[PDB]
Amino acid sequence: STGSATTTPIDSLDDAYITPVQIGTPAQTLNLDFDTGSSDLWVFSSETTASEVDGQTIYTPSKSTTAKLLSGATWSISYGDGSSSSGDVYTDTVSVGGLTVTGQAVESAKKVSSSFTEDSTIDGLLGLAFSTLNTVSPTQQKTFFDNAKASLDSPVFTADLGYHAPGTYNFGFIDTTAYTGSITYTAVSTKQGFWEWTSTGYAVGSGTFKSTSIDGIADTGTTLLYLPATVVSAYWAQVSGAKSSSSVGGYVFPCSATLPSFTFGVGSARIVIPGDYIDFGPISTGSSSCFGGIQSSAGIGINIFGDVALKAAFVVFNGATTPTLGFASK
Numbered sequence: 626s627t628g629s630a631t632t633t634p635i636d637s638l639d640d641a642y643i644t645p646v647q648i649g650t651p652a653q654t655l656n657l658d659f660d661t662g663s664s665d666l667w668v669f670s671s672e673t674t675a676s677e678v679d680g681q682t683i684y685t686p687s688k689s690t691t692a693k694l695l696s697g698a699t700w701s702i703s704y705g706d707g708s709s710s711s712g713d714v715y716t717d718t719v720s721v722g723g724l725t726v727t728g729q730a731v732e733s734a735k736k737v738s739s740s741f742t743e744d745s746t747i748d749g750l751l752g753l754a755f756s757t758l759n760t761v762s763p764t765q766q767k768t769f770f771d772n773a774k775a776s777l778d779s780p781v782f783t784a785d786l787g788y789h790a791p792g793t794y795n796f797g798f799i800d801t802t803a804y805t806g807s808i809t810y811t812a813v814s815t816k817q818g819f820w821e822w823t824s825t826g827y828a829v830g831s832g833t834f835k836s837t838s839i840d841g842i843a844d845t846g847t848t849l850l851y852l853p854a855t856v857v858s859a860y861w862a863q864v865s866g867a868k869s870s871s872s873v874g875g876y877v878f879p880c881s882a883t884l885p886s887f888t889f890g891v892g893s894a895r896i897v898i899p900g901d902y903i904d905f906g907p908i909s910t911g912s913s914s915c916f917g918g919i920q921s922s923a924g925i926g927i928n929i930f931g932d933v934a935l936k937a938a939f940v941v942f943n944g945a946t947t948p949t950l951g952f953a954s955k
């Protein structure tokens with residue numbers, strides 16, 4: 626089997642992407658944030674504290690003839706930005722782009738943090754990291770991909786995120802029309818539960834490539850590119866007036882600037898992130914100070930190849946017995 630679904634930016638900055646997901650019988654379609662940096666599929670629901678729901682579409686398990694309470698199971702998750710959610714668990718039928726999994730754990734939120742409430746466009750998360758990170762207790766549950774993979778034509782999914790435009794998540798096949806040149810595959814460590822790999826270096830604009838190993842994660846659920854402070858300083862030094870602002874929480878730059886590209890290495894291959902991809906717009910409405918899309922990972926403890934990087938590539942998440950990652954230009 627295969628599946629193919631369009632993923633759409635939630636706003637004009639590509640702050641996140643949402644993908645429609647069918648849950649239950651009859652189908653209830655929710656728009657979920659596909660997140661290769663976590664492993665829980667959770668949704669706003671009829672169980673979510675009423676004051677914490679503000680415009681989201683909810684899953685109502687009592688209206689699904691295939692929903693079953695997973696007795697005694699609870700979940701609770703925190704993300705790197707300090708947001709969180711928790712609740713109980715159902716199993717139900719979940720379909721993405723025509724690919725169906727029966728008995729998928731659907732984690733129903735009883736509580737969500739304010740940031741979720743305040744974002745009407747995201748109805749929940751669909752985790753695509755390794756199932757070892759799943760938070761369900763006392764019986765850990767499998768991701769949608771983990772459940773689907775034996776049925777897939779090939780045990781892979783691909784992320785093809787758009788810049789200020791829709792893109793595609795495919796399951797079970799590689800669309801050879803969706804990229805240019807060849808896909809370069811690179812080793813993955815699953816030891817921390819992530820799609821963790823080592824980039825071979827970087828360049829800033831038309832500058833020379835610096836060969837250096839940068840261990841980090843491919844994370845569709847993180848907006849920005851978080852890299853070591855040395856690398857980030859070298860990038861922003863090429864933008865007149867750019868500076869790190871403790872009050873804003875990262876590098877800012879004059880909105881009048883033209884940003885240089887940023888290249889990252891995948892083996893001997895190179896992925897080029899155009900300068901425009903690194904502009905996250907005014908820090909507050911009407912400001913002439915703009916927020917940068919490349920930020921330091923120093924306070925995080927891990928480097929993160931988030932959407933800013935991934936959207937510049939066609940990315941293969943290869944879930945073979947020994948997982949690997951592939952990157953192609955597009």
Ligand SMILES: c1cc(CNc2ccc3c(c2)OCCO3)ccn1
Nearest residue numbers: 640641660662704705706708846847
């Ligand atoms: C997974 C989940 C989260 C939760 N926080 C979050 C999720 C989506 C967002 C977001 C914030 O802020 C910008 C809009 O999209 C953050 C990172 N990885």
